[PDB]
Structures are given as C-alpha cells and as structure tokens.
Ligand binder design. Structure first.
Ligand SMILES: [Fe+3]
Ligand SMILES: [Fe+3]
Ligand SMILES: [Fe+3]
Ligand SMILES: [Fe+3]
Lengths: 238, 202, 238, 238, 238, 202, 202, 238, 202
C-alpha cells in the first residue's frame, strides 16, 4: 500500500477559531482565514516515542504522585480505542492527559480556586496505544471547575487529552466529559462546537460491565483521528 | 466513516499534562523538553526563540509550542518518511516548550533542517513545522518557520508561493542573529491584527 | 493479557428462582437470597474435554441412534456461534443437547405421553465449538410436549442445551425454541424470564439460505456466555 | 401606470457579505454596513441592448466556438422565464452566461486544473429575453470544479449567469446548479445563502418532456428579479 | 471446510426475463420457465486468470487509450469490495467494465449518436480483486445515453461491469449508476428490477473523503455475488 | 446476509468491454478470445458453431457467448475441482466470442470434454456449459451442449434426465459434422417459440 | 409574491462570460467594453481610473467593474427616464471593464455626466453609479463616483448628505488630474479597513 | 415559433394493450412491442373540420333525436376545456361523444339488454372546441351497463368521447365517468389504467354552481392531449 | 405540466358516435364517411380494402378504421403542413369506416398519396397513416400502408428502414389488384400471431 495524504480536516466538525461566547478566543483568534495547503512529507510524518522511557505508573494517576497515602476521590478507570477516520487502529500513539483533582482544583501555580489540594494527587499521566489502538489509564474523577468567562461559569468535570500519532496533520488536543454531567449542556467551551453529534463525541460513557467490584468504576471513550488515503495511481506526495 | 474527534482548547493549565516540571510537578523520570540536540546530533546548532502576541499586542504567558522538523539532511526521523535515506540516528525531530509565565518568551535548542522534497518532484526550502496551543485557542494553530538566510530557497518554496497575498509571506521568515558565537533565529508570532502570522490548515 | 474475574451475572436477564406460574419452582427455590462472592481460581477455571473421546455421529441425532431405518420427522440442521458477552468467541466449549422426538415424546423412563416413540431416534447429542465458537448438529425437529403444570399445559417445540466452557462461572443450561411457534407466547417456563428481549434470545431463527435442497432445513441460534474482564493494574485474583 | 421605486432588496434572501466558510470573502467584504438610500432616476434606469449586435450563435455554446468538430460532453438545453418579484415578465433583459467545459475546466488563463481543455468549446454565451421573459440557450453540461477554499473543495456543476434588465437596482449575478448533484449539499459558496428555500431557487430542474430525442436533454430554470411598485398618489421619485 | 453448492439464486431479487417495458426483451425472453438443477462440479468451478497477462494501465480508462492528450470529462475514481452473500471476500475475481464517454457516446460501430467521440478515450478496462475483494479503477464519468425504447428514452449515466469469480454459478453482468442522477427514476431497464432496495444496490455512492484534491472525485460501489454453503454431513456434490 | 447484486442486460455494445477487438478497440495486449486449444492441449480438436435466434426466428447479431468446460479427462482447470486428478496444464477451459454483426454466426475452437463426475457417485455425459448475454436479455441465460455421438452417455445423464419434458432434451444435443478432416458440432440456440432451447437456473 | 433569486459571487473567471477578449476568447463580433464615448457623443471626455484594494491593502487583480450614467445633460439613455428631455442619441451610458491581471488598474473612457433630478424636486450633483463583482464578493457592491471639481453641487447632494458619518463622504469623491490635455479622475475603492469606501444598498 | 414534434406519449399513463382482466383484450392485443418512430409531417398534421357542416342541435343529445317528446332521464350539461400537456388550449378540435340512454341501453343493433329503449333519445353528438379550448354539450345521464366480461359485470355510467385535433399523434378515444359512482372502483376496463391518479383523470366532477335551476345539473370535465415542443435550434422535422 | 388523458377502448358500440348511419341512427345531416374523393379531387383513384384479424385468425366484425394521408402531390390538407406548397383544395385527406357486421370487410375510396418529405431532408415513400379502434383494444393502434408497386421508394423509406426486424416490413405493404379498370390495394391487418402487422407508437 502506497499512502497518500490525510483526508481534509472537516472544519465543520470543529469549533471555529472565533467564538465570542468563549471570551478569551476574541483576542486569540486569527482574523484571516487559514490557508489550506497540499500535504508534503512534513505534514504526513511524526515523531516516534519508545516505551522504554515511560515509567510503570505513568498511566496510573492514583499512584504516580501518591506520597503518604491515596488520593481522595472517585477511583475510575478510563479506556477505549484510538482509530483513524477510516476505522483503522492507531498504533503506538502518544496519549497525554491532565486534569484537576476531586475538588476541581488543578495542581498549577496559576490556580487559586478555594477547592482543596490533594497532597497525593498530581493530575497527569501518559500512555502509548497498543497494536489495536487500545489505551487504558486509572485516575480520580475530576470535580467541576469554576472559572471566569462570565462571573459564575463552571466547567463540567473533564479530562484534558493530547495525541501525537503517525502524522503531524493528526496532532490533536481536546477534552472529554462524563456521561450524565448536567454542566455539559451549559458549558461555553463545549458549545464552541457547532453540531450536537460532535459534542456527544466528547462524552465518556459509563462502562458498567467493566467496573471492578469494591474497587473502581469504568468509563469508555474512543478517539478518532484523521486518516490517510491510499494511492493507486500517481503518487505526487514527493 | 467516522468523524474526527472535535478539538477543544488546551486550557490555561496545559502545562500540567504536557510540561509537568514547568508546573512544578515531578512525576516522570523522562520529561519531554525543548532540546532536540543530543551529543552526536549532526548539523549546525541553532536557537529558535520569540514570543506570541494576542490582538492587543500583548504576549501570551500561557502558550505551549511544539515543533517538528527533518534532520540536517532533510530526512524526517519518522517511519512515514519515504526518501529511502538513513536519518540521523540521534535526532527525535520534535520538541515542546512553554512561554515564560513572566516574560512570555519561548525557545528551542535545535538544528537547522536540510531541504525536504516537495510534491511533484519539487524541493522545499528548509523549514520547521510549528504548532500553538493555549487558552482561547480552540484548535492548535499550524504555521512554518523559514530562515532569512535562505532567501534563494524561500523564493522557490512551493508552500510560500501558494500564498497569493505576497506581503504575508515574510511573516513566516525568522531573522538570523548571533549572540556571540551562537546562531539565533528570532520568530515572533502574531495571532491577530497587523502583520498577523500566516496560519495553515494542513 | 492478564485476565481478571468474570463480569457479574445480571440477575435481571434471568428468571428468578421463585416463579409461582411454574409450579414446581415453589418448593425447589431457596427462600434465602443467593450470597454473592468475589471470584477465585475455583470460579474462573473449568475442565477440558478432548475431541478424541467423541464419536463421529455424536452431533448427528438423525443417525447416532438409527437402527433399522431413519427417524420419522423434520430433518433440520442447527448451527450458530458461542461468544462471551464481550463478543469474544468461545473455543472448544462442550455443547450437549437433548430433546423429544417428532411426536413430542422423550426417550425417558418417566415419560408416559401417548405420543409415539421412534425406534430410530435417541434424542441426544454433543459437540465442541471450534476456534470461531461455531457449532453445528443435525436432528429431527421436536414436537410440542404436553405436561402437567396447569392440566392442559404445552411446551412449545424446544431443544435442551448445556454448556461447559472456560470458567465454572459460565456453566449454563437452557432451552431454545423455533421461530414462529405460537406456543411460545403462552409457555409458563419461558415466561419465568422477566424481559421480552431476553425471551427472544432463546429463539432459533429460520436460516433459509442455508437450507439444503431436497434434504434439510436450517435454524440459526447463537449463545452468549459471561465474559472475563482484563486486568491492567492490581491482580487480586490470587 | 406611474412607476415608483423598486421594492427593497430583502437582505435575508441573500448571502451576507462576510462568510468565513467562503475564505476569500474575509478580506473582500466591507466591515461597515451598507447605507440604504431612497431611489432616484439613477437607480431605476438601465441601458438598452439592441439585438442587432448579437450573432446567430451567441446563445449556442455547442457551436459558437466549434472549430474542427463538436465539443465533448452532455448536450443540454436550458430555458426558463425571467420575472420580477410581482410576477411580471422581464422583457429584453440581457442574459450572459459562462461555464467550465465537460472536464470542469475553464477556458481562462488563471485556470491550471488538470481537467482537459476542449478545443471546440468556449464556455460563454448571451441572449435577450423575449416579451414573455422567456430565454433559451444550448450548451455542454459543465463538470464539477475542484478549487482551493479548504484543500479538497469541489464546486458542484454550475453555470454562471448575469442579468441587466430595466433598472440598475435589478443588476444581478449568480449561479445555478443541476437537480440531483450531490455536491450541492456541501458547497461553501452555495451555503453562504441563509435559507434552504433560497438555495433551492438556484437549482435547474430536469424538464424531461422537453428532452429532444437522440439529441439533447433539457433543464428548466426561472429567474426572479426585484420589481417596481406602482404609484397612485404622490410621485416623489423626481 | 468442505464446500457444498452455491445458495439458490433468489429470482425475486432480479429482473424477470420478460419485461414489456424494456421492448427488446419481448422477443429475447424464453416462454418456458427456467429448469432448476442441483449443482455439480460444472456449476461450482470457474476459470483462473493470471495477473501476468494484464497491462499496467488496464484499470485506468483515463490513460489506457490516451494518444495525443487526456480524455475530456469528469475525472473519477471508482472502488469498492466484492463479497459473496455470506459476507466472504471474493479474491482474484475478474472484473471487466465498459462505458460511453463524457458525451454519452460509445466507441462502437453500431453507435450513431450525435454525441461527440473522444479520440483519447476507449471506454473499457479490467482488474482482478485483491485478497480482501477490493477493486479500483479510474475513468471519465459517462454521460447519459439516448436510445430507442420509446422514442425519447435516456439511459442514466452508467458503467457496465462483468464478473467471473470462483464458481460458474456466480457469473454476473450488470450496470451501476451514480448517486443523485435524476434519470435513475425513469429508466425502463433499471425498472425491470422488482424491488426498490435492489435498484438502490446498483447505485455508486459519492465517497467525498476519498476525493483527491485538484484531481479526481470518487465513488464507492460494492458488489455481492452468490456464496457457497459449507457441508458438515453428507457431501453429495460428487 | 446480503442479497446478490441484481442483473442487468449486457446491452448492445457489450463488445466494448468484453471483446474490444471486435469493436475495433486495441487497448489490451492480451485479449481473451474463443480459442481454447493451445499448442500442447490434449484431446481431439472440435469446432463449436451455430446461431442464436429470437422469437421471430431471426438471429441475434449482437449476442455474446462464453463456454466453460473440463479437459479431455473430465477435470476442470479450477481450484474448485475436487477430483484429485491433475488437469491439463495447457487448458484454460473457458472461452468467449460474439456473433458476427452481419451473419449472426458464432464459433469456438476447443476440445471435446471428458466425462465429469455427477452428484451421488453418478457420471455426467460430456458437456460444455454455455451462457448467453445480449441486449434484451436481462440475466445471462445458462444452457448445456451435449454431443449426438455420445448417445449412450446422454441417455444416462442426470441433468438431461432431470428434465421431465423428454422432447425438450434434444434441444441440448449438438450435431456432429466433418468439414473435410475437422470435427464440427452445430448448436443452434432458440430463445423463444418452437424447439425453444432448454435454459437452466444453476 | 416571489423572492428575488439569491446572489452568488461572479467567481475568479467572471471574464469568460462578461469580458471574453480579456480571457482570450473570440466568440462575439460585438464585444461590450469600457468605452462609452462614440464619434458624435456630446460632453467633455474624461477618463475614470483607479484600483480596488482588499483588507490587506492589496489590489484585486480579478475584479470586474461596470458603470451607469446620464449624458452630458443629465438624461439617462433609458426608457425609464421620465424627464421628457431627448437624450444624447450616441450614448449607451453603460460600460464594463476588468482590472489588469498584473497591476490591478482599471479604467473607462467616458463623458462627465450632467446633473440629474433628485427626489422631491431636488437636484443631484453629477455622479456615476458603479458596481463591483469579483471572487470573494457575494453580492455586487454598489457605490457612486462624484467629482472634486463639483464641490458646490456635492455639498447639496441628497445622497451624500444622507450619510450621517460625514467623514466618509469624501471616499466617494474622485480627484481630477490632467495627463497633458486629457482630464482624468482617479477613484480608488477600498473594500475594507481605513478609508473604506461607502457602499450602498440601492 | 417553429414547432417541433409532439412530446413522447408516456406509456405509463395509459393502459397496456394486454389486460387479462379485460377479456377481449387477450386476443386483440399485439404480442410484439410497438415500434417507436421519430415524427414526420405525417404525424404532426391532422384534418380540419368546418363548423358549417354541423347542425344546430349536434351538441344537444336531449333534442337532436327527439321526435314526439323529450327523452326520459336526468337532464345534465357537460362542459370543460381541452388543453395540450403544456397547458395550451386546443382550438377547433372535433369532439364526438356517444352513450347509452337512461336505462343503460345503447341504440345499437348488437345491444340486446333488457333495459328499455327511449324513442326520443339517440345517444350521439359532436362539437368543435372554441378558441379557449372550451366545449359544451347537453344530454341525459347514462345508466350503468351490464356486460359479459365476467358474467355479472357492470360498466359504471359513462360517456364515450373521441378527439381529432391538430396532430395525428394526438388522436385519442376514451371514456369519462361521473363523480361518486360506486361502480367506478370495480370496473375491469377502468382498471386497465395503471395509476390511481390517471383513473381519476377520467371522472367528471359535479359543478353545482353551474346547475341551471329547475332545469339541468352540470358536470365539469377537462381533457388533456399531447403537446408539441418548440424548436429553437435545428429543425429536423423536414 | 399535465398528463395526457388516459385512453379507453372505443367499445363494441363505437358506431353510435362515430358512424351513426351504420348503427341506423340518422341525426346528422352531414355524416363523415370513407369517401375521400370529391368531384375535383386530383390523382388516381384507388380503393383500399381488407380485414382485421384477431389472435384466432378471426376477423373483427366491430372494428372502426380511420386513415390520414397527403394529396396527390404529397401535401397534407393541414395548417401544420410546412411545405409551403398549395394543397389540393378538394381533399380532406381523412376518412373513417367500419368493418361489415357480417363479413368483417372494410374499405375506403381515396387517392394514392404523393411522396412526403421525411426528417433531415429525406423523402418518404407514399403511405397512408391508419388507426384501429375496437372492443378489446385499449389504445388506438397506429400503422402505415405502403404500396407494393412503389418498391423502389419503399426500399429507401426511413420509417420502414427503422424497423430492424426486416421480415416484418412486408406486413406494411398492400398488394395492388385491378377489378376491371379500378385499382385496388388489399391490406389485411393481423393484430396477433404470425405475420402480425407492425404497429407504431407515434
Ligand atoms: Fe480544564
Ligand atoms: Fe450502456
Ligand atoms: Fe465557477
Ligand atoms: Fe360503453
């Protein structure tokens, strides 16, 4: 198989750059339209990360920062699959996540929220997807986060995730939420996304059969990245 | 066919998950950074630095940047590179950094990339692919860094020439400087207003 | 892959132990609630049966008991797949079936039904599922069976089946019926099952494309067993 | 009848000037709102074109540029009526059309599309409507056109048309498409139009009864222009 | 696996032989009913074609006949999968296609249509499906074809295809159309097919994600052939 | 379970795609034809010829024909053949031709097939499977060609005996002739009317 | 009552259909152009030229322009003119041109229009109605060209005075020049940004 | 206006020739399909009938045969318009009608129905349409007619009509019925027509506002004939 | 656009309304008949006669026939005739008759038509357009009558040559006879079975 370029990103399935409802986007959004280009080797290539460099607890947010005891909060496992738009699994992709603790408090110098800090929780982890595009990490369910967009704004509970896969054109950063959270319907950030079906694509579903008795609950969340088209005639990539 | 997962801003605390140490979090033994040059990395060392400004001309003190580039011979350390040439075995080709919380300055210690093949047998001028993530930015912004000392190559670059508004091409050219004996390319990014940096949908 | 315990049996997808409509259950159902336990090696292990011990006609109820001639009745083939709840195929599982003959008469000492006995039909067979969880046997379609629950009770045509797979927790015995049988809607035994969707899970579907011309008809019937969860963190099984 | 001014153009039935989805509109759209004015003789008058100046093949795109042979493509006839919003026919209006060839290739210096050029096709014609506002021309059905808005953008097959009628306020340029073209639902340019009913107003309908056997197919497309109101009291136009 | 015979062709999913609406079928349709037979080795076997005999441009109708330049018309790629009715892929099946050019003109001595001939287009190609039953060819989208059934009859744009696979019983010749073509609803030939769902099975769907920027559009079209049943008991084939 | 793709007529120009050369189109180097006999093909050469007539007794001048047969030993050159015998290595067993635009005559140069095993241990008389495609024909018509000089084998043939209307069996038997030293079997197909050829749904 | 047919951009190749010769297409014998002055046309000849700039200050090299004006006596060569005066028999009053593909300059050779009656017995200052069509422009943009040497008439013009933002009125006044003996009015149009030209919804 | 050929007759809007339900059609219907031809002067021309030849009572079936008194039955007026398919009126077309009397008895030698003959009723009339395609005649409403298709068959009340207009291709003979007649839903002849909308096209509607007090009732019935297409390019008719 | 009024059989009593006198009904003073020749009609008189047979070979004793033809010079007495030639002022060109209730024979007294122009500058052989109406016939059947003594013209006739089944062309040719001094063309129509007359959809 001789691969061609990645399929065109469908701008309609993503939030626009300018979204007045999400205030900080007003000054941090280009006024000019993005210039689309035909892909070259630069856009279809991406770095490789060896698993040798990852620690044993890198995907365990419950223990990778635990000092004196366990973090306070809801023990939950999150897993799922990473595929490209054509359904092909994405192997060995770097998945990085970060979140606030159970109080909705981030371990970051710029966070002054009254929510209590957890000395045993860090809030960040990472993993590589396997040959089936499968990924899995453990964590404490994050609490909603109050922030200043409009004075009384509240982010629904959420986990930040980033992916670096096979092509630079696939570079993606986003956030996923938990099924049933009532704050999902009023979040200005989630509302930057035009369609309803795309908003639901960011919701992790309760996976009851995979709950671990007297231990942890579990959420299922699949991620879809752009996919490459195969070439059967001219190969103009190079 | 599935739709691509919708993008969301990295948020103000993007450092927690992508640059733990900058957020004072020591959890990983191996931390990804802004240093692409190793002991046996080939090519001339260079420093890429600058700032990112908003629509008010103010620097973003919470922006995160990543770069992707080829080695000194124009070969990407990626299995997707089809050139058939052996890449520099001591080069990841990727780096990440964050603007300084106080000044807004960012920088990478890397190597000047070699010319990479373009489409239809063309040749691209040396460049570094760069992406911007930050609060207020809904989707990572893509752009490229070219070098002013490669005027001849830039004039023939396919991507730069695909921009019909010629006056904007210069926003993608970094300026070479020399702090003593070190080569430094200054690249300031302007998200909005005049001299707004060109951004690509790749 | 390090396997954990089998997912919890969903008591709601099964008939309760006490079902007044099915009379004999009144005295043969515990009054106390079942005590749930965390699984150990005992519950996740099961015996292995070598195919060497099975005869060539063990899965052919039309011929495994034929003496002077062929059994009287509807020549039908029944096949399908055995999977665990997570969709994984169940390999080399022992499947045992037994049924009445075309008259609705069982070859059992305790059966005095006026329905005629067939000297060439036994009514029992067995097989092992293959690597894809596929199973297949041949038989005579059983006739409905009159029995005494309420004086004029009639079991719809049915075949009894039993499975012994990879884990003891999977041990299952049940019955399947044939699509279209009008007796299905009034059977007290089938009605012990709470939901309608679960009742339909016991109906073998007509598989017309797999009918064998001038020979046999064919029914498709898939069986789903409990499945094990994978473990990615602590392994408390032992 | 003493005519007054043309009815106000309903801005809601037209695309706005600023349409981010159609990239080039970002820099070519006024930031200031249009200033509405009361009409004068300047706005209600328009030039007159004598038919004496038009050639016999001006409305025949199949033959007006044919040199050695006929153009390659689908022989189609397009006709319809031009009326003002009040239903009155628009007589002797200048209709000018232009399109790409069957390959979706325009005969224009700035078009480098790989689609093949047709030495016998020009792609432009013109006509004057008759006393009933009726117009008719012949052409080759244009093929879809790939263009760079987003890298893989494709214009559905379309024909460009321009009208100069009785009043300058009526000056209109637009494009019409062909019924059934699947590219119609994803075109960013067609989507600049707010309502769905207005989008459908640009679709030429298959007119099967007017097909010419073993020769040409036919499409029906009516155009509606702004209309003047009659005055029965004060005449402030002058 | 010991294969048996192919499943019976479902006469209801195909046009009858006698179809008055399609005039030429009146004299070329048997008056007697077809005589069904049990299959033998003759019906389940078929020839094998080595790829060594095929040229590099056999599946490229844009270039396999190009002399001085490129053909005029819509550059389109057509791909899809060939499966048997049970979903199994059909490997190394010979696929042969032929069509008219962009003018709706066939390169055949008996075609006198006024539609213009393209000196650089032949209208025929062939391929072998791969191990996944996948096939792919390039061509110019054919223009509708006027023909004499009723005097003003018009075939919607279409491509003729023929398949020779693993069994003679699978021998199939048909035609596929393009999504959105309005001529599809009035074609007497397409109407010979009884059901609506079967008519839609001949429509190639627009595959926008697989469009190649500034180059070609793409259609997806899957073909389903008859499939063999497996045998687990008597093997009467021989 | 999926439904079989519905059939459609091959149309009047079926030659373009299946017999390019007959339509004066030279695009393929290797063209499939009506000659099944190669240099080292075993068996006695024979010529199969005839015409196809419509309901008016008029020949179809646009019909396309294909045949499928076993080698001289009754073995099909197909991986689906389960006889366990080695097939003639120089025999495709398949051929295609088209009636002549002017006369309507068609013909194949092949080999007389050997007896092939029937169902349930029976033996089929030598035969060639033939299919008809053409304008006006919605689904390819299947039929078989038996040979009149195999009277004894035909009398015991399972397929021929599965036809309860005995008088129709003869429509499937070709007549042997001898143009000089060549063996020729004439097989005329009648789609409609009297002596209508038997057609099978296989 | 019917709705007006929705507008669509003229597109980048608008020249094919409106200015064939500029696209190198010779199909019409009589081609509409930018020359409104004939042999016996009355009035003083003038040349109207300029450029159209986008939001970046760059000229549009693919814009098409048309003008509509009255004769030297303020009478439109239109049956809709109700003045009752005889119009110049040698004046179409309309013209069309396209910016130069390379420089972006456009121009018309016409006559300076006479004052035309305004509404309610008022008198309009001399002006030319102009419209802009081009890629990126969804609906033709309407504007007017007044002349700086008609300061007294402009000060009393109803349309110019209907613009409440007085500083914008000047964007509609062309500047008179004199290349030798020819009178030239320079009129630059700015679609966006500072000094943005006033556009009307007529 | 240079007229071309008449639009193709839509065979789907008419009964087929072979209709088993209407018995006599079995032996009087061609077995061969009709051969469609391109029209010539022969098909687009038709005879002209001067009104000078028509008598004053030709369109009055109540009086044109009245000898000693008035016919027995329901005095009804029937009027309507004759148009071509494109809506154009058909001027000076010859309309001929004939019907049975109020008893459902025809004045024809071959009619032996027991229904009583009316010495003052003939049952036939004729007219020419005016410049607006308008026609009008008076008559006695016909009674249903028993006939032998199936032994107890009954034609709903109906009037036979024939038209000879501008082109031979327009030649048409048919029958119209009266709104509300319950026999309409079971008539084998009316059922030869495929669609329901076409069947309703033969029903005359009650026109109450045009009833004439203490005199006659009135029915409205419009007739549509094939129409000619206009030619704007080649005129191949001759 | 409206659909054509659906056709219905003329029925067994079609004579009442189209041939009153044959049904013994005298209501009209001027009755349309089967005599197209008037006192001053030009051309050679001819008699067209024959029968119409059903699928059993039995004549229809209730069929009604009409013919439409040009004058002796090939000009139709119709305003739709575009030849620009003056037509015979004493020729209606149309006639109607009914088969005899007892024998089934029908006939017309007319003139042999002159050659009429065909499409694309061709010339049609002399012919008469004929239509059949009757019980059992749902839609009037169209056909044409050519003459056997016009063999040369018929061989070049466009309509006759548009019939690909050549053997059927003869069903449209009437045979010339001469009962004493009168010319008679016999034309038998066969609706079904062998030698079925060709019918057109015009
Ligand atoms: Fe957050
Ligand atoms: Fe075709
Ligand atoms: Fe365009
Ligand atoms: Fe009747």
């Amino acid at each position: 198989i001789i691969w061609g370029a990645y399929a065109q990103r469908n701008t309609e399935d993503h939030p626009p750059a300018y979204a007045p409802g999400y205030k900080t986007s007003v000054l941090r959004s280009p006024k000019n339209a993005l210039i689309s280009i035909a892909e070259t080797l630069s856009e279809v290539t991406a770095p490789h990360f060896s698993a040798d460099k990852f620690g044993p607890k890198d995907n365990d947010l419950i223990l990778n920062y635990a000092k004196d005891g366990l973090p306070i909060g809801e023990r939950v496992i999150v897993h799922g699959y990473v595929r490209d738009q054509f359904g092909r699994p994405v192997k060995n992709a770097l998945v990085e996540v970060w979140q606030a603790n159970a109080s909705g408090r981030y371990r970051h110098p710029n966070d002054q929220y009254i929510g209590a800090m957890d000395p045993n929780f860090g809030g960040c982890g990472r993993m590589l997807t396997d040959d089936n595009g499968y990924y899995v990490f453990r964590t404490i369910k994050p609490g909603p986060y109050p922030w200043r967009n409009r004075i009384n704004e509240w982010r629904p509970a959420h986990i930040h995730f980033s992916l670096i896969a096979d092509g630079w054109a696939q570079r993606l950063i986003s956030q996923f939420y938990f099924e049933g959270d009532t704050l999902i319907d009023s979040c200005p950030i989630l509302k930057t996304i035009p369609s309803e079906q795309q908003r639901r694509a960011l919701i992790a579903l309760e996976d009851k059969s995979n709950f671990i008795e007297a231990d942890s609950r579990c959420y299922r969340f699949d991620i879809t990245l752009r996919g490459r088209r195969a070439t059967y005639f001219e190969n103009d990539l190079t | 066919e599935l739709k691509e997962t919708p993008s969301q801003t990295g948020g103000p605390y993007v450092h927690i998950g992508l640059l733990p140490k900058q957020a004072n979090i020591e959890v990983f033994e191996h931390n990804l950074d802004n240093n692409l040059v190793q002991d046996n990395t080939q090519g001339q060392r260079i420093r890429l630095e600058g700032q990112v400004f908003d629509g008010l001309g103010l620097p973003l003190r919470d922006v995160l940047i990543e770069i992707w580039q080829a080695d000194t011979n124009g070969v990407y350390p990626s299995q997707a590179d089809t050139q058939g040439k052996q890449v520099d075995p001591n080069f990841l080709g990727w780096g990440r950094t964050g603007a300084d919380f106080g000044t807004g300055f960012w920088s990478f210690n890397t190597i000047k990339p070699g010319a990479v093949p373009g489409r239809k047998g063309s040749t691209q001028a040396p460049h570094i692919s760069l992406i911007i993530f930050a609060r207020g930015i809904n989707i990572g912004l893509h752009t490229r860094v070219y070098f002013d000392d490669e005027a001849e190559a830039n004039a023939k670059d396919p991507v730069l020439n695909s921009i019909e508004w010629a006056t904007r091409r210069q926003t993608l050219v970094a300026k070479r400087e020399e702090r003593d004996g070190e080569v430094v390319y200054r690249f300031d990014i302007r998200i909005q207003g005049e001299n707004e940096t060109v951004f690509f949908d790749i």
